[PDB]
Every structure is written in C-alpha cells, then in structure tokens.
C-alpha cells in the first residue's frame, strides 16, 4: 500500500499512540474488574518479591517499573492465575529464559 | 546433578546469596567459583571477544563508524534472515565468524551445558543464570573496547530488547561511548514464534523456551514498540530504526522506519496491528490437523512447509502450552 | 465462566463502553489520515445526497445522524473507495436490502 | 421488466418522485398504483394482519401482556432458533402461523416477486421498495391494533434493528401504546453470517443480500449494541433484554442481560468481543479448501456441516464479496 510520509506519517503515529494507550489502560481496567469478581488475590509486589526475584539481577531498579511490569502481567496476561503463589512459578520461568 | 540445581549453585563455592546485586556481586567474584569453572569462564570470554573483535574489524574496514547494531524482536521472529538480508555490512561481518561474536545472554549456554565433556548434560535453565552473568561480563568488556585504529568497536546486540529500561540502557550505552544505534525491529505473529520454537531441535543450540516466555515476550515487545520509535523520531542523531513485519504469506515487509530523522510508514495497516498485542486464549489451543493445515496454507516454501508440519505433528493433540513445555524439557 | 453481577457487572460495562468509544473515535481518526494520504475525495453529504438517498425514506431525519452514519461508513468501512461517486453505488446497494 | 426497474416504477402510475417523503407519500396513495397491484397490496396486508392477529391472540391467551417482541441481530445470525428456544411463549404462538405474522420489511418480497403468476419474476431488489412500503403500512395498522379483550396486540419485530434511531423509534412506539419491550439480541461472527447467506437457497424465501449489506449490518449492530443495553439498564420498566453470542463450536450462549432491571454479564470475554466490530479485509478473502475445512472444523452437526460445505463449494475460488454477489443475483 501507499507509504505515509511527512505530516501524515506523524499524525498516523500520534493517533495510533492514543489508540494503543486507551487499549493499554482499558486492558488492565477490565482485567481488574474480572479479578475482583472471581476473587483473585490482590497483587502485592512485596509479597511476590519474598517468593521470587523481580529485579533482573539488579538490571531492573525503579520500583515504579517493577510494579507496573508485574502487576499488569499478573492481571492482564494471566487472568486464570489466582494466587501470587502461582504467579511466582511463572515469573521464575520467565527469569530462567532469555 | 542430584536435581535441576543451577550451575551457579553447583560450581559456586559456599552458600548462594538470594538476591543480585548480592548474588550478582557474588557471581562477579572468580574466587566464588571452582577453578575448573573459572577456567571455563575465561576460555569462553576469550572465544567470544575474539569473535566480536573480528566483527568490529570487518565492520570498520567496510567504512562503518562505531555502531551498536540492535536486533529487537520476540523469539523466533526471523531476525537472522532480516540481519542477513537487510543489514549487508553486518551480514558481511557475520559471515567471517559464522554468526558468532554477538551479545546475547544465550551465547554461552551450549558450551556451559556441555562443560567441555562432549555432551549436553545441563538443561538450558540450569545454565541460564551462569550464562547471563557471562554475557554481562562479555558486554562490559566490549563497551569501551577498541579496534586497531583506536576507534570504539562496533557491537551487535540481538536480545528481545522488549522493555523500556532495556532500550534506555542501550541508548545510554551508545551515547556514552560515541556509538550510532542501528536498530532493526522484527515482528511475527505469536503463532509464528510458537511454530518457530517447535521447529528448533535440541541438538541445535537455538533456545527452546516454554509458552509463557514466548507469549510474555510477544506482549512486551509489541506494547513497547512505539516508545522505541519515539526515541528515534525525537533524536535523529541516535541512528536509524526499521520495523519489519510479517505478511500473510509469511514474508517480512518493512512497516515503519526512521532513517536520518525521516519518519515514514510503509504499511499503515500492519503498523496498527503490530504495535499492540491483541489479547483476543492461545495457550490452550490444541494442535490438530486443522491448525497444521491452516498454517501450511500460507507457507509456499517446500523445505519450510515440511519442517513446519514435521515439528507440529510431533505434538499433535497437544495444546500450544503443553507442546512448548514438552519440547522445552528436551536436552 | 463466572457471571459478573451487581457492581462488577456495571463497572465492567462502564469500562468496556469507554474502551469501545476510544476505539470508535480512533477508527475514524486513523481512516481520515490514511484518506488524506491516498487523496480520497473529501466526504460531502450534500453532494452524496444529490446522487442517492440517505434518508431511509424519511425514517432517518436528523441530519447530524445522517452525516455521522455515512461519513464514518465512507472512511472506516470502505477505505478503498475513493470517490463519492463510487460510494453511492454502495449506499444504493444498502438501501435495496433489509 | 425491460431492465431491473423496480415494481414501484412498473406498477406505479405516472412519474416517480425522487425522494420520500415525496416518493413516500406518492407510494402511500393507492390511486398512484395500478388497480391489479393495489388489489395485490390489500390481499397481502389482509393475510399478514390475519397472521399477526393470530400471534397476538395466542400470546394474550398464554398470559402475555401487550408486548413488542424485538429480535435484534445481523442477517443469518440464528435468530429463528433463538426465538424458538429462548422465548417459549412466542415459539408457541409462531407455531400456529408457521412463523408468519412478524413485522419484517422482507415479509412481502416473495409474494410481490411472483405477482400471483406462480413463479418468481422480479429480483429481491426490484420488489424491495414496494415491500418496504407495505411493511410500514402493515406495522402502522398494528400499532394501535386490539385483540378481542380490547387489549393492545402484542407484535413481533425481527429486523436487524442495528441503528439508534431504529431502537429509539421502537421504544417510543412501545411507550406510547403501553407495550413492554422483550428484546433478544443475537450475535454471530461476520463469517457465520456470510456462510449463512450462501446456504440460503433462491427457492427458499430467506433473503440473499450481497456482501456490503451483511458487513455494514455487522458493523452497525455491534457498534450500537451497548446503547441498546443502556436503554434497559436506565429504565427497568421498558422490559427485558438478552444478548446471545456464538461460541467457537457455533453454539449460542447468553452473554449479557437486563432482566427486571437486574444487569449481569454471563460471559465477559464474549461481551468485550461482540460490542465492537473488530475491523482487523474479509471481502477479498478467497473461499478455498482451507477456509472450508477451517469452518467445518468447528461444526459438529452433520446436516449443518454438509449444507455448509455444499454452499461454500459452489463458490470455491471466489472471494466472499464475489460469492455473495453471485449468489445474490440468482432468482
């Protein structure tokens, strides 16, 4: 198809960003409502950190990043996981691979 | 060993500290290792550094200024092919090392898993921590590495590079060491990554991760894609960015690019698709005749078509999650 | 799966509405940028109305509705249609059926 | 006739005014019609009204208060099955009329297309305008229609009802005439509607619209779905609402409902899917062996499986758009 250039490319890029940001926000919002309804355990980084490592061997430092990454993963990607305990198995799996 | 202990517990001296940078600084200390293993570490860093230096010399001789070549993309998206075809200066260098010399946390895995014994005896997961630590030391020695002209060495990083903090750190590395950033970002649909992983043979050296690794990698690389592009839209002197996506027939096409500050969208439809993870559940989907036929219907290359169905047939009747899990546990 | 009830159902419903409204808006926004880039003819209700009927035999009256329906259809559903002239064939087709 | 002129041009007296309500008021005037056609119109309204009145009497006798039964949903989504199974009071009434008596702009089409000659001679599109006008007069006579108890008659509206203005008008009709609104909203994926249309035989009376009708109907019914639900969430005394969607194996399941002001979501995942049209292009997709097999893979019922592949095989090698177009032009 036709390549978008100059101002059109930029504007398509800007509008797509807004679209993906609303989708991003909405995915978590919707997952949280469903998590309350099934009685999924509230996400707690500290408790999770006690049972596995969420620093990437220290590569990941900013705690506002570690929360965002793992809370969102817990609710959005793994909606059938119900406990922080189970989610730890998963996180450990992710850390064992590249 | 006795169970799936890691090689850092097995070859590490004394108790294993629970959390890097406490486990990190413990790993970083050679005295914390058995002398045989420490000797193995030195030998592999020397092999790797020799390969990287070869890449750097080839690249500089071909008129390439100090550059961090970054190959972003989820597992088994077709990054090697793209590099080979779409970065010809790198393709010429990689040919002189048979693809060795790149910065990749998996580069040491086979050597560590065989431990010079002549056969693979540790699982990928057993050696992962050790090889991650070796890759970081490898990369550390490269950051201010020089060629014979005194120029900073070009380097090649082919990690998933899925997260912002990863992206930020490599940009900072490049900025601090005077390197350009040549970034190729390669996308395939999740199912292509899953099929790609099942085609990888244990006797082959390419990693075979289980489903959650591939899926979570996919979500992250897609969700953080436009942030990467912004870094290049915002700072043309950073280097160049190109995004390649997968058409229905499985061919890579360019989707977006920032080349010399110029931003263009070569494929708006794909650009919209491959900047989000489209959560609409794949892990439980069963590999049956229909799935196999469907995937075959969009593969015209005979060798690839054959390898693809052969890999899938081995796990027919299994869910994606169960297939990758089973294929992952093979040594 | 578990039925959502009471406040959870309502909240899932509210959050889904926002999601679909951003998607709704974004689909048109993105289609307009692409339409400018390919030089697709600007949507003009009056000109379209001169070549076909956009009232549903008078069932459709509110002109702010007729515009919204057809402009959005023109850009979002039929992005490869480039002229109001071609789009008229389509609208005529839609009006010939239930 | 001489070309595909409409029956309103052919049987209409004098010039045809360009725009209803100018063409509308012209159509509404019997003197504007040939006497044979005007006589045909009267006969079909009498048949239809007799059927509706039968429905109304059955419904009232079964203790049903004055009700507008509305069956919302795109073409060929499986509305008849849902009505038959999920509205048992209506199923009992419809059985006494063999499904006749409903308000539907297509109800008169076959009769008008045969013109009492014994064979179909006009295309659906030729008779559409005329039958739309007859349906509106039919509906007009029903709005204050009474049963033998003096109660307002229950009526059945099975249109797509895709647009807000349609929804608002039927609510207003119900409010003004003291009717409850029993609304069943039925969803299927677009491809199910396309397959559904290709299975419809010309000798059968169910309409065979071309692709843009089915696709545009799908977009509109999905995009306006939650507005409909809001009307019921906001006003429990309006009546009841139920949404049924299609699972992977093709079975209808309840997805959301408002019953006596109570709002519940029986299937959150489907609810998210079927409230948006998911624009991610189907019109050009070619019907080949793979598409046919894929669709068959999720049909377990033998008769349905067979009819489905038989319909698709007739247009193998054609795009959806070309298949529906060809199937539409059949008389």
Task: Explain the overall architecture.
Chains A, C: It comes from Xanthomonas oryzae pv. oryzicola. Chains A, C: This is AvrRxo1-ORF2. Chains B, D: This is AvrRxo1-ORF1. The complex is a heterotetramer, with two copies of chain A (98 residues) and two copies of chain B (331 residues). Chain A is an all-alpha fold and 98 residues long. Chain A has one domain. Chain A is 66% helix and 0% strand. Chain A is built from four helices and no strands. Chain A has helices at residues 6-38, 45-49, 63-77, 84-95. Helix content of chain B is 49%, strand content 11%. In chain B, strand 4 and strand 5 (252-259) form a beta hairpin. Chain B has 331 residues and is of the alpha/beta class. Chain B has helices spanning 7-10, 22-27, 35-61, 79-86, 88-95, 109-114, 124-142, 164-177, 190-199, 211-223, 225-234, 268-273, 289-296, 302-314, 320-329; strands at 67-72, 155-157, 180-186, 239-246, 252-259, 262-264. Chain B is built from 15 helices and six strands. A six-stranded mixed β-sheet of chain B has the order 2-1-3-4-5-6, sandwiched between helices. Chain B has one domain (1-331). Chain B starts with 6 loop residues before the first helix and ends with a helix. Classes of the chains: A mainly alpha (98), B alpha/beta (331). The A-B interface holds A 1, 3-5, 9-10, 12-13, 16-17, 19-20, 23-24, 27, 53, 55, 57-60, 62, 65, 69, 73, 76-77, 90, 93-94, 96-98 and B 19-21, 23-24, 75, 104-106, 124-125, 128-129, 132-133, 159-160, 163-166, 169, 207, 209-210, 212-213, 215-216, 219, 223, 226, 229, 233, 256, 263-269, 271-272, 275-276, 279.
Describe the structure using short key phrases:
heterotetramer; A: 98 residues; mainly alpha; 4 helices; 0% strand; extended; B: 331 residues; 15 helices; 49% helix; 11% strand; protein binding; type III effector proteins; chaperone; tetrameric
